[PDB]
Scaffold this active site. Structure first.
Site, PDB file in Angstrom:
ATOM      1  N   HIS A 190     -14.739  31.062  21.298  1.00  0.00           N
ATOM      2  CA  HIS A 190     -14.302  29.850  22.097  1.00  0.00           C
ATOM      3  C   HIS A 190     -15.585  29.051  22.571  1.00  0.00           C
ATOM      4  O   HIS A 190     -16.640  29.741  23.269  1.00  0.00           O
ATOM      5  CB  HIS A 190     -13.230  30.387  22.734  1.00  0.00           C
ATOM      6  CG  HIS A 190     -11.853  30.856  21.982  1.00  0.00           C
ATOM      7  ND1 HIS A 190     -11.481  29.294  20.525  1.00  0.00           N
ATOM      8  CD2 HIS A 190     -11.590  31.833  21.699  1.00  0.00           C
ATOM      9  CE1 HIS A 190     -10.608  30.688  20.194  1.00  0.00           C
ATOM     10  NE2 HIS A 190     -10.315  31.500  21.043  1.00  0.00           N
ATOM     11  N   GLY A 191     -15.093  28.072  22.816  1.00  0.00           N
ATOM     12  CA  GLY A 191     -16.252  26.996  23.387  1.00  0.00           C
ATOM     13  C   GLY A 191     -16.020  25.487  24.059  1.00  0.00           C
ATOM     14  O   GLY A 191     -14.852  25.225  24.110  1.00  0.00           O
TER      15      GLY A 191
ATOM     16  N   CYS B 221     -15.909  25.334  19.023  1.00  0.00           N
ATOM     17  CA  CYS B 221     -15.230  24.421  20.362  1.00  0.00           C
ATOM     18  C   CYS B 221     -16.960  23.632  20.751  1.00  0.00           C
ATOM     19  O   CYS B 221     -17.186  24.023  21.767  1.00  0.00           O
ATOM     20  CB  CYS B 221     -13.762  24.147  20.473  1.00  0.00           C
ATOM     21  SG  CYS B 221     -12.883  24.368  19.248  1.00  0.00           S
TER      22      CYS B 221
ATOM     23  N   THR C 202      -6.479  32.325  22.878  1.00  0.00           N
ATOM     24  CA  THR C 202      -5.868  32.932  21.378  1.00  0.00           C
ATOM     25  C   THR C 202      -7.656  34.240  20.458  1.00  0.00           C
ATOM     26  O   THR C 202      -8.189  33.610  20.763  1.00  0.00           O
ATOM     27  CB  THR C 202      -5.159  32.334  20.504  1.00  0.00           C
ATOM     28  OG1 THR C 202      -6.660  31.485  19.438  1.00  0.00           O
ATOM     29  CG2 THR C 202      -4.885  31.194  20.808  1.00  0.00           C
ATOM     30  N   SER C 203      -6.430  34.987  19.811  1.00  0.00           N
ATOM     31  CA  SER C 203      -7.576  36.809  19.263  1.00  0.00           C
ATOM     32  C   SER C 203      -8.516  35.149  17.754  1.00  0.00           C
ATOM     33  O   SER C 203      -7.450  34.766  16.938  1.00  0.00           O
ATOM     34  CB  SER C 203      -6.848  37.427  19.039  1.00  0.00           C
ATOM     35  OG  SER C 203      -7.626  38.235  17.691  1.00  0.00           O
TER      36      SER C 203
END
Lengths: 91, 139, 4, 92, 139, 4
Positions: E87-88, E129, E28-29
């Site tokens: 993100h991660g 994350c 997601t953005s």
């Protein structure tokens, strides 16, 4: 409320994925240095600064000696993992 | 600000010293680890910790020890120190008869599981391998 | 010097 | 006279190993908010690890998740300082 | 002792700000990340760092950027700062088009691969994350 | 509040 993972400190002898080294007579590099720095600085420095000096000691003053060329002339850096929320003094 | 360190006691110092492993594991004796365990004992004695030295614990013995320690009353203790001296892997510490997840050990003392240590520093000192990579260093 |  | 090739690294993680990291869509992420705040406030008074320690306490005490999804509501977060540094770090 | 921080320059500050991701990733953005990237830019600008903001880099662009930065001449720089906003997963950062090993990024700056940063603090600030576990907290 |  506070996180259930808070207020933990993990003082690892070595970086993630790496070997940890031990001398048959003197003991392990990390514990040697840890006790030395604690003995010298526990009443003067905050625990993270003590562990930082432990890091520089292990990193600069130790090198592996082995007849096995695979295990000879190797280095080690400890790894401080802090989920602490305050400063730590032993006095 | 700083952790309150003027509780009646400084806390426990649990030293688990694994030197000898069962032949079924094929793991070698960790010569020099007794030097470590004794030096740690002296260091934390001088830091006014209630030190408990443990030698050659099995994977099962480690778990029950850490569990029993977690169910102690640390109400008048400032902190908690655990030192692990054994063979290891990433996230793994070795008992004399096999591997133990570090997370399982540390999870005993989480803020919601060890209420008497909530808000107090829980220190885990790990002397073990975290894999099989070699640091060749640089000048 | 040995490893762990 | 050698030093480890992994030395002098510091990894400031927003969250503990294995855990989610939280972000407010308008205020920004909890960690970066706190990091910038503490840096702005203490970079000329404190060593970097002590700054990050205060970042930890800020994220831990001042933030709690709000979500329409009940699975993700009222959750907490602790940052994770991973230091392979060999000296103290000051920004002055 | 303390790191020598009085070189001519303080060093680079690389901010990688990933907000929008390729549809194949299902990510997601990341609304609000722009506030972060701007706040970081000002914070480290005030710390006298040479801040470089990068927006929506692909996995390939991140690698090539970090490679190019590592092959710069940091001889008159005190330190190096890299900030990752995306993100991660555990050990993983996301480019707009897919995952990147954190190890691959950081390995460019190892003491033996980036000589002009040897002995200097290399700081990596990661906002991502590291898994899917939730901290329910404790009072 | 969102997750990363």
């Amino acid at each position: 409320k506070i996180p259930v993972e808070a207020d933990f400190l993990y003082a690892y002898s070595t970086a993630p994925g790496y070997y940890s080294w031990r001398n048959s007579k003197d003991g392990s590099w990390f514990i040697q240095s840890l006790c030395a720095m604690l003995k010298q600085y526990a009443d003067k420095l905050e625990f993270m600064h003590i562990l930082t000096r432990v890091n520089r000691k292990v990193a600069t003053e130790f090198e592996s000696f082995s007849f096995d060329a695979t295990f000879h002339a190797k280095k080690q850096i400890p790894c401080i993992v802090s989920m602490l929320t305050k400063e730590l003094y032993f006095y | 600000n700083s952790y309150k360190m003027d509780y009646p006691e400084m806390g426990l110092c649990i030293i688990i010293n694994n030197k000898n492993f069962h032949k079924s594991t094929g793991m070698t004796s960790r010569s020099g680890t007794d030097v470590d365990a004794a030096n740690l004992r002296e260091t934390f004695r001088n830091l006014k910790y209630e030190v408990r030295n443990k030698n050659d614990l099995t994977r099962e013995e480690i778990v029950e020890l850490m569990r029993d320690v977690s169910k102690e009353d640390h109400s008048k203790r400032s902190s908690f120190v655990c030192v692990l001296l054994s063979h290891g892997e990433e996230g793994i510490i070795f008992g004399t008869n096999g591997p133990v997840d570090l997370k399982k050990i540390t999870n005993f003392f989480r803020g919601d599981r060890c209420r008497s240590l909530t808000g107090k520093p829980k220190l885990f000192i790990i002397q073990a391998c975290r894999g099989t990579e070699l640091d060749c260093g640089i000048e | 010097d040995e490893v762990x």
